[PDB]
């Protein structure tokens, strides 16, 4: 979605906007703000020519296993319409803020909507905004053990709600 491809500035809120509408650049620089496209290039690379994966099966661009931006906005769009169809995932998705909905879309990129739906206890803790407890629990998984640098970044994204695991 055009809406959910937007750059997002995780300011804690309530904001102190100057006269209700202006927020000075000097104040925003106090942040790391990116969009999901940039989030996933870090995690999944951008390759403009075919290569063939860690697994491997051959892939291209950002994590598009076949058998770039426009093809990435396809997949993201196909990720959420997935989540929104799934019956465990939609409630949590509907429930989250936007930086955290990107972390969830990220997990679905890595491991599929069925795989993610299988995180039932972490998912409960994210719908209740129990962020520490969710992070402790995700860190228990195989996902974590198997791709720890990337899982740490995505867990940091849930615990904090900021893009700061990607300042690197």
């Amino acid at each position: 979605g055009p809406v959910d491809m937007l750059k997002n500035i995780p300011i804690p809120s309530p904001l102190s906007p100057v006269e209700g509408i202006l927020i000075k650049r000097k104040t925003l620089e106090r942040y790391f703000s990116i969009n999901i496209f940039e989030m996933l290039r870090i995690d999944e690379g951008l390759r403009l020519k075919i290569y063939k994966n860690t697994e491997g099966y051959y892939t291209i661009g950002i994590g598009h296993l076949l058998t770039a931006e426009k093809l990435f906005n396809q997949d993201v769009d196909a990720a959420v319409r997935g989540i929104l169809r799934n019956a465990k995932l939609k409630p949590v998705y509907d429930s989250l803020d936007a930086v955290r909905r990107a972390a969830l879309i990220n997990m679905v990129f890595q491991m599929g909507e069925t795989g993610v739906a299988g995180f039932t206890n972490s998912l409960r803790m994210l719908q209740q905004k129990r962020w520490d407890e969710a992070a402790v629990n995700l860190a228990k998984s195989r996902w974590y053990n198997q791709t720890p640098n990337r899982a740490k970044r995505v867990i940091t994204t849930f615990r904090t709600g900021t893009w700061d695991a990607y300042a690197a």
């Binding site: 055009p2 006269e19 209700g20 509408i21 202006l22 650049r25 925003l28 620089e29």
Partner: protein, 62 residues
């Protein structure tokens, strides 16, 4: 002949002084989210952001 249509998505009734402390890199809150088609200062109808473009619902011209 031709009519300039603005497809407006929000408005922020600011005031006087802020302009122009407003500068590059700053952010303007949209304090009223809308989705509307104007011709000059005249409200025509509601559109909405779809597909890979826009669809304009009612389009009242008189």
């Amino acid at each position: 002949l031709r009519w300039p249509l603005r497809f407006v998505i929000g408005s922020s009734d600011t005031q006087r002084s802020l302009l122009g402390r407003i500068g590059i890199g700053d952010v303007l809150l949209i304090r009223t989210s809308r989705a509307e088609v104007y011709c000059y200062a005249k409200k025509l109808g509601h559109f909405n952001r779809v597909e890979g473009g826009i669809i304009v619902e009612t389009l009242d011209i008189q």
